[PDB]
Amino acid sequence: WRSMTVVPYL
Amino acid sequence: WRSMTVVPYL
Amino acid sequence: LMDKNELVQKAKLAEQAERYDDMAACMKSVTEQGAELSNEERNLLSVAYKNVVGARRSSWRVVSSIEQKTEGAEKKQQMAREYREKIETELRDICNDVLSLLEKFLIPNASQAESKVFYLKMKGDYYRYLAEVAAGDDKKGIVDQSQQAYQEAFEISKKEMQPTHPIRLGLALNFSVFYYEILNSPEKACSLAKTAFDEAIAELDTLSEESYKDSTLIMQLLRDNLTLWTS
Amino acid sequence: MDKNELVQKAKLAEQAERYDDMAACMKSVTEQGAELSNEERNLLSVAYKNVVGARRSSWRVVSSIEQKTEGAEKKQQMAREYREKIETELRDICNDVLSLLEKFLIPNASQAESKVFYLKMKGDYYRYLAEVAAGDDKKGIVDQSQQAYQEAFEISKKEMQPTHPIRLGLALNFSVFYYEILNSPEKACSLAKTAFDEAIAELDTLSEESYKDSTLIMQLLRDNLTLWTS
Fold it and tell me: How many other C-beta atoms can be found within 10 angstroms of the C-beta atom of residue C104?
């Protein structure tokens, strides 16, 4: 299991 | 669902 | 990039990176070498082109169903049509790519019978893929070409193989699907799947320590397409 | 072409999961100069991150094989050259995106929601380059990712509420930058933990369209927290 990241998704 | 198929990986 | 064993090393690695266009390009270069392929080199070339074409197949089903659900909206449907046409030439060029390997290299070498059946079911498959997409003028011939590939492999397989060989039950499964999904004959499709199945349980003495998992898997998909087709 | 049709085609490529097509559309809309919608924003994010994220996943698999292969010279020289091909593809994707942001996206970002969003994107795509950079060029790529994050961070602490999905997105990604690129778990967890607790302190300020997106990020904040402290 890795570090999790996003991109808001509006 | 749908019809199943294989190129059977052996 | 002329070393045969090195191209099989690259393809085996492209597969782990899930780069199936890269992996297809290696195993096509391996095949064109006149060769006659190992049974692992056959497997790598199957998964490659299966994943390559299978992606275009999945996109095609998504855009083709949007274009049908778009009846009445002139500009969304003209756009879904133009994208479906774009995807279909990609699918078509992949399939003509594979069927050119099978006629010039794979079917023509083929010492054994295990391999001959494998590559002529593969010919039947990739003409089916073309029939899944063919319309009008050229469809009739594209369906006939897939059925003559399947029927040759079906006859060789009844003769030279046990009813449990994953290659003979894999042909039955795909052949039954051709009858159901391409020729619209569901009764033959289920007679073929059920016969392959009942012939395989009948002679479960002939299961291998190596293949019992893989043929038991296909026997379940025979009876799952069966259960699906009867509702 | 024209903007209203390219977003329709790109929106079609997305459902067809052909993300290279969807990305080429959203680069053409961007290269028209005008600032992008809040819907045109999401599409160009989704496109390239799917495009780049594939190269990222391939790279990690091939780089882990190249390390496990020590001792067989011909098997390792073979894994090395493919990794470079894969990462060269990755480098061109990131330079493609960061050139859109410096010439079109950041300068025409009118408001603060966009200025923060597009500068977090800059930090991300420099971090993607830092994930892979070696030689003597890592040092410069890393601080430029941090100067993008830290600028966007300051505008966000100033101009946005602790629940805004774009401000919690910057905390989550910056917190990850500190952990996986700067080997500073303590700034990384202090930053994520504060972002989390300041956002719960004010659940009054969740909107009807963003509470789904804001609570999701808050959950990934405390998973990066729970992962990082065990």
Answer: 13
Chain C residues 126-185 within an 8 A CB cutoff of chain B: 166-167, 169-170, 173-174, 177, 180-181
| 3 state DSSP class of D220 | helix
The answer to whether D58 contacts chain C (CB < 8 Å) is: yes
Residue D205 backbone dihedrals phi, psi, to 5 degrees = -90, 25
Q: Any alpha helices (H) in D131-210, and if so which ranges?
A: 138-159, 165-180, 185-200
Q: What is the DSSP letter of C109?
A: S
Q: Quick one: how far is CA C113 from the chain centroid?
A: 18
- Distinct helix (H) and strand (E) counts, chain C: 9, 0
Distance in angstroms (rounded) separating the CA atoms of residues D190 and D179: 11
Residue C44 sits in a domain of what CATH number? Answer: 1.20.190.20
Long-range (24+ apart) CB contacts under 8 A made by D97-105 are D97/D48, D97/D52, D97/D121, D97/D125, D98/D122, D98/D125, D98/D126, D100/D27, D100/D30, D100/D31, D101/D125, D104/D30, D104/D31, D104/D33, D105/D30, D105/D36
Q: Is D9–C79 a contact, with Cβ atoms under 8 angstroms apart?
A: yes
State the total domains in chain D: 1
Touching chains, B (3+ CB pairs < 8 A): C
Domain carrying residue D221: 1-230
Give the mutation candidate from D14, D15, D69 for the C interface (greatest C CB count, under 10 A).
Answer: D15
Within 13 Å, how many C-alpha atoms sit on residue D133's CB side? 19
CB contact under 8 A, D220 and A6: yes
- Which chain C positions have a beta carbon within 8 Å of D25's beta carbon? none
Long-range contacts of C128-137 (CB under 8 A, 24+ apart): C128/C174, C128/C178, C128/C182, C129/C53, C129/C57, C129/C91, C129/C95, C130/C92, C130/C95, C131/C182, C132/C57, C132/C60, C132/C181, C132/C182, C133/C60, C133/C88, C133/C91, C133/C92
Closest Cα to residue D12, out of C92, C119, C198, C79?
Answer: C79
Resolution value (Å, 1 decimal): 2.9
CA distance D78 to chain C (A): 8
Q: How far apart are the first and last CA of chain B?
A: 25
- Rounded-to-integer distance, Cα C29 and Cα C9, Å: 12
Cα gap C115→B10, rounded to integer Å:
13
Structure token pair of residue D81: 């050259």
